[PDB]
């Protein structure tokens, strides 16, 4: 009988709500009221990068903190040189519709996809010298939204078919598959310890998965609309996400509930990308209204603004050493801020 | 030294990218939409993952994409097509049962934030089927549209055919002109199942879209 | 059909409800402590002179 | 979390009337455009009517004009539908959908098979 | 060996009034053209062939006004009215060269408009960068050749007795009247060559505007008619003032020249560069956005 399961299900939900309410004795804002404010932070564009023909969605800083790869809808993957603004490589793609990009930890590989439903891996250290397609991973039914390298051999990708799958590049078959999401999966982020990872979907929920097991360890809720971004805290024990409700929320795995939310009356448009600083104190988020806002993660007061673009900001990344911040957009011009 | 190598690395790239700029702007991108019953499969086959089709008319290159491998939900990947020159929209006029769902889809595309500037070229297939269906007197546009009882013309076999076919066209244009500011238009056409003039019709409507862009930046409008 | 996810869901909640959840004050204190320790290694928080910047 | 609970359906003789009410919780009701949808046996989802944010704009499907009236009370955070002179073909299961994103005037994917923000549904038979 | 330059007027009040007027107009011209150049060059996405020609025109206008006005101003304020033979010939050469390159830039812009409006799909294929660069290169080359020809034919002559020029800068007709020898060759050359050079761009621009206005009328628009008429009217008025006064002044017989021609000379030479950068450029919405951002 479905009714008894629903009656049993809602009873469990009521029990957990009391348990969460029991632990919800205080608030993060109340405790952090005695710390000094960071003040006003101003940032200026140091370098501007151009040659892209069409709009941009993807961007990722390499571990070397110098090279970075950006993908555009005209079918071109370009690797820059931030220090001296030099185009090192320009790879032509088979399918012009590309929605993601990545940079391998060892610097030897890059990856991308979109609507073609195929994950392509490119080799930048070929014996001949040119770049050729190393491998093509397929079985996904929907488009690809994000993909990250665990190492040279293992790659984890999320698709819009409401499932994520872990691949083995050498074998070319799904070693493990992740399910329970009912809506589209739009973004994921690997943990620092490379053991767990989280993915926010279009049903206002983010799930914590165990890579070794393949089962959803925990489920977090609280948003009102689609979730468009997510990222871990530097210590790996928390994450922050932005939604189309135009509010960012910080969750804690141990406390297993929302801690505090950043929002303002004047902001009525959703977030497209979020990221953290090296120390995690400053939370940078890109908005639809062509600007990025620098939030204080511990006080929620807006601390500065970055208003150098005249079109939607779609990507935002921070270097490993925390020396620079890059914010690509649909203008087709990237801009390295500092 | 290392500096000289970097300069040489660049110099070859801009030459290749410059030629890409030349061919890219020459071609026009079009997006094809319809339903399962709508004859978009027939229309694309008329002038013949994503199914690409390239056809050349009066030495201009056109590139049209058909995406059908996705799921029933389309509120996210539709945003990738905000740069197309126009959106071809095919509708079946001879089936009254699901004509309502077509109107709802058309309204959403028209008012979407990221597609406000994109013109729509509207095709109404199955006109031959519509002529036979009405003359039979089995189904009436009236039982699915009470407004038809009080409509007048603004086909030669019987004027009810003209009243019916124009009435369906009138419904689509009413949504178009109700919420607009002359930055994008609709171009309805009456096409049959077997016609060789579809390619020419797309060329003329694309031509008109370009002129209004060129005139506007030159301040003549 | 729905039993497969429901049994996983209740089993998920069975393991997810039976976890050691700490007092939120402790979680906030742990989160707050980390930022203070690493504050001095964050170029973005404290502006740095142009002498040692690679982005002069 | 977003939750929508429905009630009102039962057996009624032809030509009767029924009152359908849905309660919404977990979000600001005032900012969202609400819809009504139904599914007849052995058929796909069908759209019935919708109401704007403040109720200024109202629309109905052609097959039910002059028989159904849609109203919303933002104060108590509910939606309503009053049905009069029911026909034999009106039997179906009625769900209460909702617009996807806050503030836009477009309602994509509302009639999709697996829409996230939708109610459990109430059966109506004649 | 040395030519005296009386100027427009001699009364002290007139001298001060002229000084103030010309100084203000020169500063306004320089500032407007410089703002247009910077805004196009290094602010925004306005990199288009239209704005390329429009920036070249501003630079030409700056040079054209700078050739004439400052020398008069310094003469007026320095209580001196002396100009040298070589200086006079150099001033005339630069005057002729820059005026003609500014007369031929407009003809290039008119063809650009005609192709952009009346051949929309092939505009990108026709107006490739090399074509624009080659057109402007031939523009300078022809202007300089024309100026050199006129300057040499003027230098053929010799002056014996008089050295007073009743004009505010060196010009062809005042010197020809002051000439002490025969001048039939100069008259024939100016008539033929100047007639062709002046007449051709005028007819080209008129034909281009005829076609553009016809095409704009044909379109069944409801609102853009007033904007089209306003833009075309302003452009045609500004063009007509310049060309009509040039034709009126420089095609007089030498026995007819008088000071009303000097009044027309002041008008076109000084005023037209001042009105050029407001009529064509600064009213555009793209330029207004770029300046507002900056
Ligand atoms: C540009 C004008 C200053 C020139 C004046 C001399 C005339 C012969 C030609 C004309 O082009």
């Amino acid at each position: 009988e479905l009714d008894q399961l629903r009656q049993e299900a809602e009873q469990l939900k009521n029990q957990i709500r009391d348990a969460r309410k029991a632990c919800a004795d205080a608030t993060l804002s109340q405790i952090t009221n005695n710390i000094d404010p960071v003040g006003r932070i101003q940032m200026r564009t140091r370098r501007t990068l151009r040659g892209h023909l069409a709009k941009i969605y993807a961007m990722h800083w390499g571990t070397d903190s110098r090279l970075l790869v950006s993908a555009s809808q005209d079918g071109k993957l370009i690797i820059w040189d931030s220090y001296t603004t030099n185009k090192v490589h320009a790879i032509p793609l088979r399918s012009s519709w590309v929605m993601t990009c990545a940079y391998a930890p060892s610097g030897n590989y890059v990856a991308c996809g979109g609507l073609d439903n195929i994950c392509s891996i490119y080799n930048l250290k070929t014996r001949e010298g040119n770049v050729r397609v190393s491998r093509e991973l397929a079985g996904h039914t929907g488009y690809l939204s994000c993909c990250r390298f665990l190492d040279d051999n293992q790659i984890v990708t999320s698709s819009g078919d409401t499932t994520c799958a872990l691949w083995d590049i050498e074998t070319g078959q799904q070693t493990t598959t992740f399910t329970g999401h009912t809506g589209d999966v739009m973004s994921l982020s690997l943990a620092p310890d490379t053991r767990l990872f989280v993915s926010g979907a279009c049903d206002a929920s983010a799930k914590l998965w165990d890579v070794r097991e393949g089962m959803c360890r925990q489920t977090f809720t609280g948003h009102e609309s689609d979730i468009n971004a997510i990222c871990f805290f530097p210590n790996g024990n928390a994450f922050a996400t932005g939604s189309d409700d135009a509010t960012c929320r910080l969750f804690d795995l141990r406390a297993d509930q929302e801690l505090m939310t950043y929002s303002h009356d004047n902001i009525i448009c959703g977030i497209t990308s979020v990221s953290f600083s090296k120390s995690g104190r400053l939370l940078l988020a890109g908005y639809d209204d062509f600007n990025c806002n620098v939030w204080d993660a511990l006080k929620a007061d807006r601390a500065g603004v970055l208003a150098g673009h005249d079109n939607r900001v779609s990507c935002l990344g921070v270097t490993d050493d925390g020396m620079a911040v890059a914010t690509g957009s649909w203008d087709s011009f990237l801009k390295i801020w500092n | 030294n290392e500096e000289k190598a970097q300069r040489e690395a660049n110099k070859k790239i801009e030459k290749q990218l410059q030629k890409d700029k030349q061919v890219y702007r020459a071609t026009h991108r079009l997006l094809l939409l319809g339903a399962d019953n709508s004859g978009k499969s027939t229309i694309v086959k008329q002038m013949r993952g994503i199914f690409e089709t390239k056809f050349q008319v009066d030495k201009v290159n056109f590139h049209m994409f058909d995406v059908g491998g996705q799921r029933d939900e389309r509120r996210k990947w539709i945003q990738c097509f905000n740069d197309v020159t126009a959106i071809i929209f095919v509708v079946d006029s001879s089936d009254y049962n699901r004509l309502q769902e077509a109107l709802n889809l058309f309204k959403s595309i028209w008012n979407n934030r990221w597609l406000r500037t994109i013109s729509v070229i509207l095709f109404l297939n199955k006109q031959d089927l519509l002529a036979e269906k009405v003359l039979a007197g089995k189904s009436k546009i009236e039982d699915y549209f009470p407004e038809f009882a009080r409509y007048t013309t603004p086909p030669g076999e019987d004027p009810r055919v003209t009243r019916a076919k124009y009435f369906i066209r009138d419904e689509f244009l009413r949504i178009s002109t109700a919420s607009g500011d002359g930055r994008h238009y609709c171009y309805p056409h009456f096409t049959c199942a077997v016609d060789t003039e579809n390619a020419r019709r797309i060329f003329n409507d694309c031509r008109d879209i370009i002129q209004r862009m060129h005139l506007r930046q030159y301040e003549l409008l | 059909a729905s039993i497969a996810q429901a049994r996983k869901l209740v089993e998920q909640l069975k393991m997810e409800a039976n976890i050691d959840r700490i007092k939120v004050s402790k979680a906030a204190a742990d989160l707050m402590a980390y930022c203070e320790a690493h504050a001095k290694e964050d170029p973005l928080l404290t502006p740095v002179p142009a002498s040692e910047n690679p982005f002069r | 979390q977003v939750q929508l609970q429905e009630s009102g359906g039962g057996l009624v003789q032809p030509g009767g009337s029924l009152r359908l009410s849905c309660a919404a919780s977990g979000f600001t009701f005032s900012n969202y455009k609400m819809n009504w949808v139904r599914q007849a046996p052995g058929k796909g989802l069908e759209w019935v009517s919708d109401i704007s944010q403040s109720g200024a704009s109202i629309s109905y499907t052609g097959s039910v004009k002059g028989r159904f009236t849609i109203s919303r009370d933002n104060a108590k955070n509910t939606l309503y539908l009053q049905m009069n002179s029911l026909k034999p073909e009106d039997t179906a299961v009625y769900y209460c959908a909702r617009c996807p994103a806050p503030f836009t005037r477009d309602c994509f994917d509302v009639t999709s098979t697996t829409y996230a923000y939708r109610g459990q549904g109430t059966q109506v038979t004649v | 060996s040395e030519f005296l330059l009386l100027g427009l007027s001699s009364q002290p009040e007139q001298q001060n009034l002229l000084f103030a007027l010309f100084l203000s107009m020169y500063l306004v011209t320089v500032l407007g053209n410089l703002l247009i150049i910077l805004a196009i060059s290094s602010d925004s996405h306005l990199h288009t062939p239209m704005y390329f020609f429009l920036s070249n025109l501003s630079f030409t206008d700056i040079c054209f006004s700078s050739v004439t006005v400052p020398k008069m101003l310094v003469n007026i304020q320095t209580q001196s009215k002396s100009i040298s033979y070589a200086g006079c010939l150099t001033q005339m050469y630069f005057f002729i060269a820059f005026g003609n390159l500014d007369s031929f830039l407009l003809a290039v812009m008119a063809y650009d408009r005609y192709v952009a409006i009346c051949h929309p799909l092939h505009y990108t294929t026709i107006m490739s960068p090399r074509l624009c660069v080659l057109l402007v290169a031939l523009s300078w080359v022809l202007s300089n050749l024309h100026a050199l020809l006129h300057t040499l034919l003027m230098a053929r002559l010799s002056f014996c007795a008089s050295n007073e020029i009743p004009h505010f800068f060196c010009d062809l007709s005042p010197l020809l009247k002051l000439s002490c020898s025969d001048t039939h060759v100069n008259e024939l050359v100016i008539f033929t060559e100047g007639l062709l050079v002046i007449v051709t761009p005028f007819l080209c621009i008129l034909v281009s505007y005829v076609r553009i206005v016809s095409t704009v009328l044909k379109i069944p628009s409801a609102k853009g008619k007033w904007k089209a008429f306003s833009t075309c009217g302003s452009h045609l008025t500004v063009v007509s003032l310049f060309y009509g006064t040039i034709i009126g002044v420089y095609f007089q017989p030498l026995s007819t020249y008088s000071v009303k021609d000097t009044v027309a000379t002041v008008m076109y030479t000084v005023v037209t560069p001042m009105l050029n950068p407001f009529i064509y450029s600064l009213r555009n919405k793209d330029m207004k956005g770029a300046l507002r951002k900056l």
Side-chain angles (χ1 to χ4, degrees), chain A, chain B residues 1-137 139-180 182-221, chain C, chain D, chain E:
Chain A
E1 180 60 274
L2 193 143
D3 191 31
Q4 65 188 355
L5 292 177
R6 198 190 290 162
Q7 287 174 232
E8 187 180 47
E10 61 87 25
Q11 186 66 42
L12 289 150
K13 307 215 177 306
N14 285 342
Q15 191 273 350
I16 289 157
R17 186 181 291 104
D18 295 356
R20 286 178 177 174
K21 177 62 69 152
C23 277
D25 64 332
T27 311
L28 178 59
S29 195
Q30 300 171 349
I31 291 156
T32 66
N33 194 73
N34 295 359
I35 54 163
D36 291 331
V38 301
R40 186 273 304 278
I41 297 89
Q42 69 276 17
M43 310 200 188
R44 180 153 272 191
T45 180
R46 299 292 179 88
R47 212 66 49 82
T48 301
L49 314 173
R50 63 180 66 84
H52 267 312
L53 297 174
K55 59 188 161 289
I56 296 161
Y57 316 113
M59 183 278 288
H60 194 192
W61 281 91
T63 187
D64 206 340
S65 167
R66 179 169 185 164
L67 308 159
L68 61 90
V69 58
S70 85
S72 296
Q73 296 267 84
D74 60 321
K76 213 159 279 296
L77 272 176
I78 295 170
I79 297 98
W80 299 97
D81 195 320
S82 288
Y83 284 7
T84 64
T85 316
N86 306 133
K87 289 184 268 286
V88 180
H89 281 120
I91 307 163
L93 284 158
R94 186 179 295 276
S95 182
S96 164
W97 316 111
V98 66
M99 293 177 71
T100 176
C101 82
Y103 209 78
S106 62
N108 306 299
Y109 288 82
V110 294
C112 78
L115 267 73
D116 195 10
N117 310 321
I118 288 176
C119 195
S120 296
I121 312 193
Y122 283 96
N123 196 324
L124 303 189
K125 300 294 187 291
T126 59
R127 189 184 296 179
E128 196 277 337
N130 294 115
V131 302
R132 312 153 74 131
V133 177
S134 173
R135 213 67 174 284
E136 289 207 350
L137 307 169
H140 284 286
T141 306
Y143 68 94
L144 294 174
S145 53
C146 195
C147 58
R148 291 285 175 268
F149 271 88
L150 282 72
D151 65 80
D152 305 311
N153 196 0
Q154 294 175 357
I155 183 164
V156 66
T157 78
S158 63
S159 181
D161 190 359
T162 76
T163 67
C164 315
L166 185 75
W167 303 79
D168 192 76
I169 291 160
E170 182 65 26
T171 311
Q173 63 84 30
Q174 287 190 356
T175 185
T176 307
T177 193
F178 306 90
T179 70
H181 273 287
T182 190
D184 304 333
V185 189
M186 294 299 291
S187 291
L188 68 93
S189 181
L190 275 292
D193 294 331
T194 316
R195 294 178 65 88
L196 287 74
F197 78 102
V198 295
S199 73
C202 287
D203 200 342
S205 173
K207 282 191 170 20
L208 176 76
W209 311 84
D210 190 358
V211 168
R212 179 70 275 172
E213 292 291 327
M215 65 182 179
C216 166
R217 184 177 178 179
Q218 297 177 5
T219 299
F220 302 98
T221 186
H223 295 285
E224 274 158 17
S225 186
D226 297 330
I227 287 165
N228 281 8
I230 186 164
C231 182
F232 284 103
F233 209 74
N235 62 5
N237 294 115
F239 62 96
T241 176
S243 65
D244 269 8
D245 188 22
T247 72
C248 295
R249 294 175 200 273
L250 186 89
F251 298 94
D252 186 74
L253 311 194
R254 279 177 289 253
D256 190 72
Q257 55 176 97
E258 184 183 359
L259 280 187
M260 65 180 288
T261 187
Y262 321 96
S263 65
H264 204 259
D265 290 89
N266 290 3
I267 308 174
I268 62 170
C269 67
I271 297 89
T272 49
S273 301
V274 301
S275 290
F276 280 63
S277 179
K278 194 266 183 182
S279 160
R281 184 61 177 279
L282 277 296
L283 187 153
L284 295 95
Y287 288 77
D288 277 301
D289 56 35
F290 310 157
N291 306 341
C292 315
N293 282 300
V294 191
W295 297 86
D296 185 79
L298 269 288
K299 300 273 277 153
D301 307 346
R302 220 153 64 209
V305 174
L306 281 65
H309 280 292
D310 53 328
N311 209 326
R312 186 179 68 188
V313 179
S314 66
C315 62
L316 191 138
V318 170
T319 46
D320 285 335
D321 54 48
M323 185 64 72
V325 179
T327 70
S329 75
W330 284 6
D331 286 306
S332 71
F333 304 133
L334 308 167
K335 292 191 151 70
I336 314 305
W337 297 81
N338 187 2
Chain B
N1 62 3
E2 69 275 16
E3 177 171 348
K4 289 188 176 181
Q6 290 288 321
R7 301 317 190 174
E8 198 71 3
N10 302 123
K11 183 259 282 179
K12 185 61 65 65
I13 284 157
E14 293 83 4
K15 298 205 293 283
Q16 183 62 255
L17 263 54
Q18 179 58 41
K19 289 192 285 184
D20 279 3
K21 182 69 178 293
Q22 186 63 41
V23 65
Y24 182 80
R25 288 196 303 184
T27 73
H28 305 274
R29 287 161 285 282
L30 301 164
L31 168 58
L32 187 63
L33 291 174
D36 57 355
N37 189 359
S38 60
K40 57 163 194 191
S41 66
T42 316
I43 296 292
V44 70
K45 287 165 181 174
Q46 188 56 226
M47 76 291 288
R48 258 176 194 164
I50 62 170
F51 305 149
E52 308 171 35
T53 300
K54 290 183 285 186
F55 64 102
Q56 184 178 2
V57 58
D58 275 16
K59 294 159 279 297
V60 192
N61 296 116
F62 291 104
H63 197 191
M64 182 179 72
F65 312 92
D66 179 16
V67 62
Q70 312 303 318
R71 273 164 54 264
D72 52 357
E73 296 202 46
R74 73 190 96 201
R75 67 173 165 279
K76 288 300 192 175
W77 62 261
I78 194 69
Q79 281 162 25
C80 294
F81 297 88
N82 64 7
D83 61 52
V84 295
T85 291
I87 293 161
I88 314 311
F89 192 69
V90 183
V91 186
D92 55 84
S93 179
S94 86
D95 183 32
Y96 316 140
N97 280 341
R98 68 181 65 252
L99 209 69
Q100 180 59 59
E101 302 183 352
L103 263 50
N104 298 344
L105 176 56
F106 187 86
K107 191 191 290 183
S108 303
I109 286 156
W110 200 254
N111 305 122
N112 198 2
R113 184 174 179 177
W114 310 111
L115 310 169
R116 288 185 289 111
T117 300
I118 308 296
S119 303
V120 179
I121 294 155
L122 191 152
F123 278 110
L124 296 166
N125 286 114
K126 317 302 191 57
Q127 297 296 342
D128 52 354
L129 277 296
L130 169 56
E132 294 294 328
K133 188 174 177 68
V134 65
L135 292 163
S139 291
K140 41 274 246 287
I141 317 202
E142 299 164 351
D143 79 67
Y144 315 93
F145 289 93
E147 182 65 26
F148 186 60
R150 319 176 311 209
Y151 188 89
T152 187
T153 315
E157 296 172 355
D158 186 74
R160 299 196 308 280
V161 177
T162 313
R163 204 158 80 90
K165 69 191 282 200
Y166 273 98
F167 166 62
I168 295 160
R169 183 204 68 109
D170 204 337
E171 289 292 329
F172 270 108
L173 283 173
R174 185 205 314 291
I175 294 158
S176 174
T177 181
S179 197
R183 76 277 192 189
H184 61 308
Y185 271 72
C186 187
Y187 305 90
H189 298 295
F190 286 156
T191 187
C192 294
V194 58
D195 282 333
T196 79
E197 213 193 322
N198 282 316
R200 178 59 61 160
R201 278 195 253 270
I202 292 157
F203 170 76
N204 284 313
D205 291 331
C206 291
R207 191 178 193 281
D208 205 287
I209 291 164
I210 296 297
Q211 277 193 359
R212 290 195 206 267
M213 186 66 204
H214 284 159
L215 271 76
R216 186 181 292 114
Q217 74 187 35
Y218 273 85
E219 293 179 353
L220 294 173
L221 264 74
Chain C
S2 66
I3 62 174
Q5 63 84 30
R7 75 182 187 85
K8 193 176 184 152
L9 188 153
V10 302
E11 190 277 331
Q12 181 195 129
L13 294 174
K14 190 177 285 296
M15 295 298 102
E16 190 271 328
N18 296 295
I19 64 181
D20 296 331
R21 316 185 168 164
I22 53 164
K23 188 176 175 69
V24 73
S25 298
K26 176 160 278 152
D30 186 74
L31 189 44
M32 176 267 279
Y34 176 82
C35 294
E36 294 179 354
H38 283 57
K40 64 91 176 179
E41 302 163 42
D42 186 74
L44 296 158
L45 183 63
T46 62
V48 65
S51 314
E52 56 251 56
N53 279 321
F55 272 112
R56 291 188 296 272
Chain D
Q1 61 278 18
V2 303
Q3 188 161 8
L4 300 149
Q5 184 178 2
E6 280 146 358
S7 295
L11 183 63
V12 176
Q13 296 294 321
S17 164
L18 299 79
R19 180 67 180 271
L20 294 174
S21 69
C22 175
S25 66
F27 62 95
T28 61
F29 199 71
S30 303
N31 299 323
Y32 290 103
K33 180 176 179 181
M34 303 299 289
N35 293 45
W36 270 99
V37 307
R38 74 184 184 177
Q39 181 177 34
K43 298 298 293 295
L45 273 287
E46 289 298 71
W47 180 75
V48 173
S49 55
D50 63 358
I51 186 162
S52 158
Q53 287 70 240
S54 56
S57 166
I58 291 159
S59 299
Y60 310 90
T61 306
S63 178
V64 302
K65 292 177 71 68
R67 317 203 281 104
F68 301 157
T69 69
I70 190 168
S71 62
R72 82 192 281 162
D73 193 79
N74 296 345
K76 181 265 289 181
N77 290 318
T78 188
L79 196 74
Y80 292 121
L81 184 76
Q82 173 70 338
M83 300 192 287
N84 317 291
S85 285
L86 277 296
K87 293 187 286 185
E89 293 179 353
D90 299 13
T91 182
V93 181
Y94 284 79
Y95 315 93
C96 171
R98 183 174 65 79
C99 182
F103 297 117
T104 59
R105 186 167 46 262
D106 58 53
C107 294
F108 266 123
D109 274 3
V110 69
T111 192
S112 68
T113 58
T114 60
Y115 195 81
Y117 313 106
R118 199 159 61 198
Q120 63 84 30
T122 50
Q123 176 54 272
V124 172
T125 175
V126 298
Chain E
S1 295
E2 183 178 1
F3 288 137
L4 293 158
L5 192 70
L6 301 180
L8 295 175
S9 279
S10 68
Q11 291 84 19
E13 293 83 3
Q14 297 206 18
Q15 297 269 79
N16 291 279
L17 178 137
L18 297 150
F19 183 86
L21 180 64
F22 281 100
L23 197 79
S24 312
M25 281 144 75
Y26 181 50
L27 293 188
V28 167
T29 302
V30 168
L31 289 176
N33 294 324
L34 184 63
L35 271 71
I36 296 169
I37 290 152
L38 296 188
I40 284 157
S41 85
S42 296
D43 197 35
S44 298
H45 74 277
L46 53 85
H47 297 189
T48 312
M50 159 190 176
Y51 284 106
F52 177 51
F53 303 121
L54 185 62
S55 165
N56 292 116
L57 201 72
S58 296
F59 198 76
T60 302
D61 293 349
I62 283 158
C63 298
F64 189 28
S65 197
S66 182
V67 168
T68 50
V69 171
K71 174 58 170 173
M72 182 179 72
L73 296 182
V74 65
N75 290 138
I76 290 284
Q77 204 60 259
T78 46
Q79 294 84 19
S80 295
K81 65 179 73 174
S82 297
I83 191 167
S84 177
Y85 185 85
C88 191
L89 300 174
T90 297
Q91 190 171 4
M92 177 198 319
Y93 173 85
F94 279 115
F95 177 75
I96 293 173
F98 285 106
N100 233 148
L101 151 75
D102 191 22
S103 148
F104 294 147
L105 279 171
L106 302 178
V108 171
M109 293 162 66
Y111 179 69
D112 171 63
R113 294 176 191 285
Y114 163 68
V115 174
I117 288 163
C118 294
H119 294 281
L121 295 183
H122 297 88
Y123 174 72
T124 62
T125 294
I126 291 159
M127 288 315 264
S128 63
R130 60 174 291 169
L131 185 61
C132 318
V133 169
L134 188 140
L135 288 172
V136 184
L138 277 296
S139 302
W140 292 273
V141 163
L142 296 165
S143 306
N144 277 258
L145 183 63
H146 179 218
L148 179 59
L149 187 153
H150 268 304
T151 309
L152 183 63
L153 274 171
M154 170 63 69
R156 184 176 176 87
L157 311 166
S158 71
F159 306 90
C160 58
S162 188
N163 75 320
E164 293 83 3
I165 297 169
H167 199 269
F168 76 101
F169 77 99
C170 284
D171 199 352
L172 279 149
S173 290
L175 295 159
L176 281 158
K177 281 206 87 51
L178 285 172
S179 175
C180 183
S181 178
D182 188 77
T183 53
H184 277 321
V185 185
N186 293 312
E187 293 165 288
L188 188 153
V189 164
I190 181 162
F191 263 94
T192 49
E193 205 281 343
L195 185 61
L196 275 72
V197 170
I198 294 297
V199 168
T200 284
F202 192 67
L203 309 195
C204 289
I205 296 150
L206 265 67
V207 174
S208 281
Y209 274 110
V210 165
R211 302 309 180 89
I212 289 154
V213 175
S214 311
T215 301
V216 176
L217 285 194
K218 186 178 287 294
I219 289 168
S221 182
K223 191 169 181 176
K225 307 320 191 70
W226 282 102
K227 287 183 73 63
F229 301 145
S230 176
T231 300
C232 292
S234 45
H235 287 192
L236 283 159
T237 295
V238 167
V239 168
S240 301
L241 179 66
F242 185 80
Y243 278 97
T245 43
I246 285 165
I247 291 164
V249 171
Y250 277 123
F251 284 84
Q252 297 269 52
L254 269 190
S255 60
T256 306
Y257 182 89
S258 301
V259 308
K260 183 181 175 190
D261 307 298
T262 303
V263 166
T265 315
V266 175
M267 183 279 288
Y268 72 82
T269 56
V270 172
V271 172
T272 305
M274 182 179 72
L275 302 184
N276 266 337
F278 293 102
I279 292 278
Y280 285 90
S281 164
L282 287 166
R283 290 178 323 161
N284 275 6
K285 301 190 206 190
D286 292 332
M287 185 64 72
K288 268 190 190 83
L291 287 154
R292 193 174 289 95
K293 180 67 174 66
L294 172 57

